[PDB]
Design an enzyme around this catalytic site. Structure first.
Site, PDB file in Angstrom:
ATOM      1  N   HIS A  86       9.129 -17.712  -2.789  1.00 13.02           N
ATOM      2  CA  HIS A  86       9.321 -16.465  -3.518  1.00 13.02           C
ATOM      3  C   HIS A  86      10.614 -15.860  -2.950  1.00 13.02           C
ATOM      4  O   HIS A  86      10.569 -15.157  -1.935  1.00 13.02           O
ATOM      5  CB  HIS A  86       8.179 -15.476  -3.321  1.00 13.02           C
ATOM      6  CG  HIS A  86       6.904 -15.861  -4.005  1.00 13.02           C
ATOM      7  ND1 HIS A  86       6.823 -16.067  -5.364  1.00 13.02           N
ATOM      8  CD2 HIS A  86       5.660 -16.055  -3.505  1.00 13.02           C
ATOM      9  CE1 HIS A  86       5.572 -16.389  -5.674  1.00 13.02           C
ATOM     10  NE2 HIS A  86       4.857 -16.390  -4.572  1.00 13.02           N
TER      11      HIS A  86
ATOM     12  N   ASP B  29       9.978 -18.765  -7.586  1.00 21.06           N
ATOM     13  CA  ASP B  29      10.489 -17.736  -8.493  1.00 21.06           C
ATOM     14  C   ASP B  29      11.610 -17.075  -7.691  1.00 21.06           C
ATOM     15  O   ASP B  29      11.620 -17.135  -6.455  1.00 21.06           O
ATOM     16  CB  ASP B  29       9.472 -16.783  -9.066  1.00 21.06           C
ATOM     17  CG  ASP B  29       8.499 -16.147  -8.106  1.00 21.06           C
ATOM     18  OD1 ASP B  29       8.889 -15.828  -6.965  1.00 21.06           O
ATOM     19  OD2 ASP B  29       7.313 -15.965  -8.484  1.00 21.06           O
TER      20      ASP B  29
ATOM     21  N   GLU C 100       5.317 -22.153  -5.319  1.00 13.29           N
ATOM     22  CA  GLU C 100       5.202 -20.972  -6.181  1.00 13.29           C
ATOM     23  C   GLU C 100       6.563 -20.353  -6.467  1.00 13.29           C
ATOM     24  O   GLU C 100       6.755 -19.146  -6.383  1.00 13.29           O
ATOM     25  CB  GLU C 100       4.295 -19.948  -5.475  1.00 13.29           C
ATOM     26  CG  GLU C 100       2.869 -20.472  -5.286  1.00 13.29           C
ATOM     27  CD  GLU C 100       2.004 -19.624  -4.466  1.00 13.29           C
ATOM     28  OE1 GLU C 100       1.791 -18.363  -4.778  1.00 13.29           O
ATOM     29  OE2 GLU C 100       1.421 -19.969  -3.415  1.00 13.29           O
TER      30      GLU C 100
ATOM     31  N   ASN D 161      -0.335 -23.746   2.993  1.00  9.87           N
ATOM     32  CA  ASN D 161       0.658 -23.092   2.125  1.00  9.87           C
ATOM     33  C   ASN D 161       0.982 -21.681   2.584  1.00  9.87           C
ATOM     34  O   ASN D 161       0.068 -20.941   2.968  1.00  9.87           O
ATOM     35  CB  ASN D 161       0.030 -23.083   0.719  1.00  9.87           C
ATOM     36  CG  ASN D 161       0.985 -22.680  -0.387  1.00  9.87           C
ATOM     37  OD1 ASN D 161       2.012 -23.317  -0.603  1.00  9.87           O
ATOM     38  ND2 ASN D 161       0.632 -21.601  -1.084  1.00  9.87           N
TER      39      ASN D 161
ATOM     40  N   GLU E 248      -1.682 -18.644   3.354  1.00  2.92           N
ATOM     41  CA  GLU E 248      -1.168 -17.434   3.987  1.00  2.92           C
ATOM     42  C   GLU E 248      -1.856 -16.950   5.249  1.00  2.92           C
ATOM     43  O   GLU E 248      -2.234 -15.774   5.375  1.00  2.92           O
ATOM     44  CB  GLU E 248      -1.263 -16.310   2.922  1.00  2.92           C
ATOM     45  CG  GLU E 248      -0.457 -16.639   1.668  1.00  2.92           C
ATOM     46  CD  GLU E 248      -0.525 -15.596   0.575  1.00  2.92           C
ATOM     47  OE1 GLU E 248      -1.198 -14.544   0.704  1.00  2.92           O
ATOM     48  OE2 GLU E 248       0.112 -15.849  -0.470  1.00  2.92           O
TER      49      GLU E 248
HETATM   50  C1  LIG Z   1       1.266 -17.079  -4.185  1.00  3.73           C
HETATM   51  O1  LIG Z   1       1.759 -15.977  -4.887  1.00  3.73           O
HETATM   52  C2  LIG Z   1       1.317 -15.910  -6.239  1.00  3.73           C
HETATM   53  C3  LIG Z   1       1.952 -14.635  -6.808  1.00  3.73           C
HETATM   54  O2  LIG Z   1       1.524 -13.543  -5.995  1.00  3.73           O
HETATM   55  C4  LIG Z   1      -0.210 -15.855  -6.231  1.00  3.73           C
HETATM   56  O3  LIG Z   1      -0.687 -15.763  -7.560  1.00  3.73           O
HETATM   57  C5  LIG Z   1      -1.100 -14.450  -7.923  1.00  3.73           C
HETATM   58  O4  LIG Z   1      -2.349 -14.218  -7.286  1.00  3.73           O
HETATM   59  C6  LIG Z   1      -2.910 -12.936  -7.506  1.00  3.73           C
HETATM   60  C7  LIG Z   1      -4.152 -12.794  -6.630  1.00  3.73           C
HETATM   61  O5  LIG Z   1      -5.081 -13.823  -6.863  1.00  3.73           O
HETATM   62  C8  LIG Z   1      -3.142 -12.742  -9.014  1.00  3.73           C
HETATM   63  O6  LIG Z   1      -3.476 -11.407  -9.377  1.00  3.73           O
HETATM   64  C9  LIG Z   1      -1.929 -13.120  -9.849  1.00  3.73           C
HETATM   65  O7  LIG Z   1      -2.264 -13.173 -11.234  1.00  3.73           O
HETATM   66  C10 LIG Z   1      -1.354 -14.480  -9.438  1.00  3.73           C
HETATM   67  O8  LIG Z   1      -0.119 -14.718 -10.108  1.00  3.73           O
HETATM   68  C11 LIG Z   1      -0.757 -17.132  -5.576  1.00  3.73           C
HETATM   69  O9  LIG Z   1      -2.173 -17.201  -5.559  1.00  3.73           O
HETATM   70  C12 LIG Z   1      -0.243 -17.167  -4.159  1.00  3.73           C
HETATM   71  F1  LIG Z   1      -0.689 -18.303  -3.499  1.00  3.73           F
END
Ligand SMILES: *[C@H]1O[C@H](CO)[C@@H](O[C@@H]2O[C@H](CO)[C@@H](O)[C@H](O)[C@H]2O)[C@H](O)[C@H]1F
Length: 302
Positions: A207, A238, A236, A170, A128
């Site tokens: 996402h 969803d 990731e 990513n 990011e």
């Molecule tokens: C892509 O997005 C996912 C979902 O936001 C991220 O995973 C989340 O990361 C946070 C911060 O570390 C955690 O609190 C969540 O449990 C986790 O699902 C992922 O790291 C990111 F690349």
């Protein structure tokens, strides 16, 4: 045809993966369904900077190894996530800037990658780095303030640390070909390829939701990045409301691109997700298969 997602994906040489959380590994429904259906694992939080290096120079791989070991014991490969990111830094790293931060970033990549040397198929080296919006600018962070070259240095460091791993960049909101953020990432990767920066893959978080909706041009995005000489991966995934149609579309977009390595959905059951209220995954809270599961499996089976 095949009866599970991972095996169905493997018929075309691809994988179907999920995010795994160490805290859920005592849940028998979760471990049995995740074990059956996926052939690729990403640690949800355990391989991030705060979890792996809680104090400078003092690594803690206990929870990360629990996820890693679970994956290998269950026949899955592992995507490492993530080595350099503005979010979730331990307080000691948040206090660093400039050259001191650069050295700590490099040391962190070297220490984590050495622990898993030759055991991780793909690494999300940098996560990011672009801002959201129309500017296409880099996101503000201590890492970005250390210089525009922070990303390239992370990649060169990672290549030397473990030459067998595929190194990925990513990001999210980079799936629609027409978006400024997508174009910023595209030009960065194009630049990296011209200058010899060792980047092997691009991860599309995927996402999808009302504010950042899936578009059929995601296929064009995947194809155009693949033409730069990099592999692409859906990392990731969803989708708000988990619509079967959209889940089938995304799956078929990956299947149409030769260098689309596979798909990872971000969680197993809807209740395992941070976005559980939008019920965006493939399994219900009780472990049963929804309509989206059936659509994805059918697409993977052709
Ligand atoms: C892509 O997005 C996912 C979902 O936001 C991220 O995973 C989340 O990361 C946070 C911060 O570390 C955690 O609190 C969540 O449990 C986790 O699902 C992922 O790291 C990111 F690349």
């Amino acid at each position: 045809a095949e009866s599970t997602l991972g095996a169905a994906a493997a018929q075309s040489g691809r994988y179907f993966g999920t995010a795994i959380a160490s805290g859920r590994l005592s849940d028998s429904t979760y471990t049995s369904i995740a074990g059956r259906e996926f052939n690729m694992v990403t640690a949800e939080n355990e391989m991030k900077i705060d979890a792996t290096e809680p104090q400078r120079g003092q690594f803690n791989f206990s929870s990360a190894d629990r996820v890693y070991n679970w994956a290998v014991q269950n026949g899955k490969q592992v995507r490492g996530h993530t080595l350099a990111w503005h979010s979730q830094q331990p307080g000691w790293m948040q206090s660093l800037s400039g050259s001191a931060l650069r050295q700590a970033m490099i040391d962190h990549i070297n220490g984590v990658m050495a622990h898993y040397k030759g055991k991780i198929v793909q690494w999300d080296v940098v996560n990011e780095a672009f801002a959201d919006g129309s500017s296409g600018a880099r996101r503000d962070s201590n890492l970005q303030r250390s210089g525009n070259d922070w990303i390239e240095v992370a990649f060169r460091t990672a290549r030397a640390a473990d030459p067998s791993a595929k190194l990925c960049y990513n990001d999210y909101n980079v799936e629609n070909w027409t978006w400024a953020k997508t174009q910023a990432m595209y030009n960065m990767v194009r630049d990296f390829k011209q200058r010899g920066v060792p980047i092997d893959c691009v991860g599309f978080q995927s996402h999808f939701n009302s504010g950042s909706p899936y578009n059929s041009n995601f296929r064009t995005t995947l194809q155009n990045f693949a033409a730069l000489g990099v592999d692409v991966a859906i990392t990731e995934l969803d989708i708000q409301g988990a619509p079967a149609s959209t889940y089938a579309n995304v799956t078929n977009d990956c299947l149409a691109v030769s260098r689309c390595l596979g798909i990872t959905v971000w969680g197993v059951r809807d209740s395992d997700s941070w976005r559980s209220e939008q019920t965006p995954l493939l399994f219900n809270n009780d472990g049963s298969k929804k309509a989206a599961y059936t659509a994805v499996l059918d697409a993977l089976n052709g």
